[PDB]
Protein backbone atom coordinates (compact mmCIF):
# COMPACT_ATOMS: atom_id res chain seq x y z
CA UNK A 1 0.00 0.00 0.00
CA UNK A 2 1.16 3.51 -0.88
CA UNK A 3 3.75 2.17 -3.37
CA UNK A 4 2.42 3.02 -6.89
CA UNK A 5 4.13 1.61 -9.98
CA UNK A 6 3.88 5.04 -11.58
CA UNK A 7 6.31 6.59 -9.08
CA UNK A 8 8.66 3.68 -9.76
CA UNK A 9 8.47 4.03 -13.54
CA UNK A 10 9.15 7.78 -13.26
CA UNK A 11 12.26 7.04 -11.22
CA UNK A 12 13.51 4.85 -14.09
CA UNK A 13 12.73 7.48 -16.74
CA UNK A 14 14.15 10.33 -14.68
CA UNK A 15 17.67 8.89 -14.30
CA UNK A 16 18.16 7.41 -17.74
CA UNK A 17 17.15 9.11 -21.03
CA UNK A 18 40.17 1.39 -24.99
CA UNK A 19 40.26 -1.63 -22.68
CA UNK A 20 36.63 -2.82 -22.56
CA UNK A 21 37.10 -3.44 -18.84
CA UNK A 22 38.25 0.13 -18.18
CA UNK A 23 35.31 1.63 -20.05
CA UNK A 24 33.05 -0.57 -17.96
CA UNK A 25 34.59 0.53 -14.67
CA UNK A 26 34.27 4.14 -15.67
CA UNK A 27 30.64 3.67 -16.64
CA UNK A 28 30.05 1.96 -13.28
CA UNK A 29 31.47 4.92 -11.33
CA UNK A 30 29.34 7.27 -13.44
CA UNK A 31 26.14 5.34 -12.73
CA UNK A 32 26.79 5.12 -8.99
CA UNK A 33 25.87 8.84 -8.67
CA UNK A 34 22.70 8.37 -10.72
CA UNK A 35 21.82 5.33 -8.61
CA UNK A 36 21.46 7.48 -5.47
CA UNK A 37 19.17 10.00 -7.17
CA UNK A 38 17.19 7.05 -8.50
CA UNK A 39 16.77 5.54 -5.03
CA UNK A 40 15.66 8.87 -3.60
CA UNK A 41 12.88 8.80 -6.23
CA UNK A 42 11.72 5.42 -4.91
CA UNK A 43 8.72 5.80 -2.55
CA UNK A 44 9.50 5.87 1.18
CA UNK A 45 13.16 5.11 0.54
CA UNK A 46 14.25 8.55 1.87
CA UNK A 47 12.10 8.17 5.01
CA UNK A 48 14.55 5.52 6.23
CA UNK A 49 17.39 6.60 8.52
CA UNK A 50 20.48 7.73 6.59
CA UNK A 51 22.54 4.81 7.92
CA UNK A 52 20.00 2.29 6.61
CA UNK A 53 19.96 4.05 3.22
CA UNK A 54 23.73 3.56 3.10
CA UNK A 55 23.49 -0.17 3.91
CA UNK A 56 20.81 -0.82 1.29
CA UNK A 57 22.68 0.94 -1.55
CA UNK A 58 26.07 -0.53 -0.70
CA UNK A 59 24.37 -3.95 -0.55
CA UNK A 60 22.65 -3.84 -3.96
CA UNK A 61 24.46 -1.25 -6.09
CA UNK A 62 26.05 -4.02 -8.15
CA UNK A 63 22.83 -5.90 -8.90
CA UNK A 64 20.89 -2.66 -9.46
CA UNK A 65 23.37 -1.51 -12.12
CA UNK A 66 23.85 -4.87 -13.86
CA UNK A 67 20.07 -5.18 -14.30
CA UNK A 68 19.84 -1.69 -15.74
CA UNK A 69 22.53 -1.93 -18.42
CA UNK A 70 21.24 -5.37 -19.37
CA UNK A 71 17.70 -4.14 -20.01
CA UNK A 72 19.17 -1.20 -21.90
CA UNK A 73 21.12 -3.72 -23.98
CA UNK A 74 18.04 -5.67 -25.08
CA UNK A 75 18.28 -4.02 -28.53
CA UNK A 76 22.02 -4.74 -28.85
CA UNK A 77 23.18 -7.55 -31.16
CA UNK A 78 25.85 -9.46 -29.22
CA UNK A 79 26.97 -7.18 -26.43
CA UNK A 80 25.88 -4.47 -24.02
CA UNK A 81 25.31 -0.73 -24.11
CA UNK A 82 27.15 1.40 -21.53
CA UNK A 83 25.70 4.52 -19.91
CA UNK A 84 28.69 6.36 -21.42
CA UNK A 85 27.24 5.55 -24.82
CA UNK A 86 29.82 2.89 -25.77
CA UNK A 87 29.08 -0.63 -26.99
CA UNK A 88 30.93 -3.66 -25.70
CA UNK A 89 30.68 -6.59 -28.12
CA UNK A 90 30.96 -10.19 -26.90
CA UNK A 91 34.18 -10.69 -28.92
CA UNK A 92 35.69 -7.60 -27.35
CA UNK A 93 34.81 -8.65 -23.80
CA UNK A 94 36.17 -12.11 -24.63
CA UNK A 95 39.50 -10.65 -25.73
CA UNK A 96 39.74 -8.81 -22.41
CA UNK A 97 39.54 -11.97 -20.28
CA UNK A 98 36.01 -11.47 -18.97
CA UNK A 99 34.21 -13.51 -21.64
CA UNK A 100 32.82 -16.09 -19.21
CA UNK A 101 30.92 -13.54 -17.08
CA UNK A 102 29.94 -11.45 -20.10
CA UNK A 103 28.32 -14.50 -21.76
CA UNK A 104 26.38 -15.21 -18.56
CA UNK A 105 25.10 -11.62 -18.68
CA UNK A 106 23.92 -11.98 -22.34
CA UNK A 107 22.51 -15.46 -21.81
CA UNK A 108 20.89 -15.32 -18.38
CA UNK A 109 19.90 -11.63 -18.33
CA UNK A 110 19.92 -9.65 -21.63
CA UNK A 111 18.50 -12.46 -23.82
CA UNK A 112 15.89 -13.50 -21.23
CA UNK A 113 14.80 -9.88 -20.79
CA UNK A 114 14.43 -9.58 -24.56
CA UNK A 115 12.42 -12.80 -25.02
CA UNK A 116 9.69 -11.87 -22.51
CA UNK A 117 9.92 -8.22 -23.46
CA UNK A 118 10.32 -6.96 -19.88
CA UNK A 119 9.06 -3.36 -19.83
CA UNK A 120 10.61 -0.46 -17.90
CA UNK A 121 7.87 -0.56 -15.28
CA UNK A 122 8.75 -4.22 -14.62
CA UNK A 123 12.48 -3.44 -14.52
CA UNK A 124 11.90 -0.67 -12.02
CA UNK A 125 9.86 -2.79 -9.62
CA UNK A 126 12.50 -5.51 -9.80
CA UNK A 127 15.32 -3.09 -8.90
CA UNK A 128 13.15 -1.60 -6.16
CA UNK A 129 12.81 -5.11 -4.66
CA UNK A 130 16.57 -5.57 -4.89
CA UNK A 131 17.03 -2.18 -3.22
CA UNK A 132 14.74 -3.23 -0.39
CA UNK A 133 16.91 -6.13 0.71
CA UNK A 134 15.82 -7.00 4.27
CA UNK A 135 18.75 -9.46 4.58
CA UNK A 136 21.23 -6.56 4.50
CA UNK A 137 23.47 -6.78 7.58
CA UNK A 138 23.25 -3.80 9.93
CA UNK A 139 19.70 -2.63 9.24
CA UNK A 140 18.23 -0.86 12.27
CA UNK A 141 14.77 -2.17 11.31
CA UNK A 142 14.87 -5.08 8.84
CA UNK A 143 11.15 -5.81 9.36
CA UNK A 144 10.38 -2.30 8.11
CA UNK A 145 12.52 -2.78 4.96
CA UNK A 146 10.78 -6.11 4.62
CA UNK A 147 7.39 -4.37 4.66
CA UNK A 148 8.40 -2.11 1.76
CA UNK A 149 9.70 -5.03 -0.31
CA UNK A 150 6.30 -6.75 -0.06
CA UNK A 151 4.49 -3.58 -1.10
CA UNK A 152 6.64 -3.36 -4.22
CA UNK A 153 5.99 -6.80 -5.59
CA UNK A 154 2.36 -6.46 -4.54
CA UNK A 155 2.04 -3.58 -7.02
CA UNK A 156 4.16 -5.37 -9.62
CA UNK A 157 1.94 -8.46 -9.67
CA UNK A 158 -1.17 -6.27 -9.93
CA UNK A 159 0.53 -4.41 -12.77
CA UNK A 160 1.33 -7.66 -14.62
CA UNK A 161 -2.01 -9.35 -14.08
CA UNK A 162 -3.52 -6.23 -15.58
CA UNK A 163 -1.12 -5.41 -18.39
CA UNK A 164 -0.50 -9.00 -19.52
CA UNK A 165 -3.66 -10.93 -18.51
CA UNK A 166 -2.83 -13.67 -21.04
CA UNK A 167 0.43 -14.46 -19.19
CA UNK A 168 -0.50 -15.63 -15.63
CA UNK A 169 3.06 -16.75 -15.04
CA UNK A 170 4.71 -13.45 -15.95
CA UNK A 171 5.01 -12.22 -12.35
CA UNK A 172 6.85 -15.36 -11.15
CA UNK A 173 9.01 -15.35 -14.31
CA UNK A 174 10.16 -11.82 -13.42
CA UNK A 175 11.11 -12.75 -9.85
CA UNK A 176 12.89 -15.83 -11.25
CA UNK A 177 15.72 -13.75 -12.67
CA UNK A 178 16.73 -12.45 -9.21
CA UNK A 179 18.64 -15.64 -8.34
CA UNK A 180 20.65 -15.21 -11.57
CA UNK A 181 21.12 -11.51 -10.91
CA UNK A 182 22.41 -12.31 -7.38
CA UNK A 183 24.80 -14.92 -8.79
CA UNK A 184 26.04 -12.69 -11.59
CA UNK A 185 26.22 -9.76 -9.20
CA UNK A 186 28.62 -11.70 -7.02
CA UNK A 187 30.91 -12.90 -9.79
CA UNK A 188 31.23 -9.37 -11.16
CA UNK A 189 32.20 -8.17 -7.75
CA UNK A 190 35.00 -10.76 -7.60
CA UNK A 191 36.38 -9.35 -10.85
CA UNK A 192 36.36 -5.78 -9.50
CA UNK A 193 38.17 -6.87 -6.35
CA UNK A 194 40.80 -8.64 -8.47
CA UNK A 195 41.27 -5.64 -10.78
CA UNK A 196 41.82 -3.43 -7.72
CA UNK A 197 44.35 -5.88 -6.32
CA UNK A 198 46.35 -6.23 -9.54
CA UNK A 199 46.65 -2.50 -10.00
CA UNK A 200 45.76 -2.17 -13.67
CA UNK A 201 42.31 -0.92 -14.67
CA UNK A 202 41.64 2.60 -13.31
CA UNK A 203 38.92 2.77 -10.68
CA UNK A 204 37.27 6.09 -9.80
CA UNK A 205 36.54 7.42 -6.33
CA UNK A 206 32.90 6.42 -5.95
CA UNK A 207 33.38 2.95 -7.42
CA UNK A 208 36.41 2.64 -5.17
CA UNK A 209 34.42 3.65 -2.10
CA UNK A 210 31.92 0.86 -2.73
CA UNK A 211 34.72 -1.75 -2.63
CA UNK A 212 35.44 -0.72 1.00
CA UNK A 213 34.82 -2.62 4.22
CA UNK A 214 32.61 -4.39 4.92
Amino acid sequence: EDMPVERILEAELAVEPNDPVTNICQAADKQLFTLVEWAKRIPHFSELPLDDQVILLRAGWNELLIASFSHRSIAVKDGILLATGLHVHRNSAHSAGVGAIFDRVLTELVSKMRDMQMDKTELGCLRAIVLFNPDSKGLSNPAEVEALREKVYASLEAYCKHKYPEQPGRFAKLLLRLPALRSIGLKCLEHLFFFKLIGDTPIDTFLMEMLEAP
Binding site: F33, K40, L50, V54, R58, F206, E212, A213
Partner: peptide, 11 residues
Protein backbone atom coordinates in the same frame (compact mmCIF):
# COMPACT_ATOMS: atom_id res chain seq x y z
CA UNK B 1 33.78 5.73 5.96
CA UNK B 2 31.38 6.00 2.98
CA UNK B 3 32.17 9.72 2.81
CA UNK B 4 30.77 10.32 -0.72
CA UNK B 5 27.69 8.15 -0.32
CA UNK B 6 26.57 10.04 2.80
CA UNK B 7 27.01 13.45 1.14
CA UNK B 8 24.93 12.52 -1.90
CA UNK B 9 22.18 11.10 0.33
CA UNK B 10 21.92 14.20 2.51
CA UNK B 11 21.87 16.82 -0.22
Amino acid sequence: KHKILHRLLQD
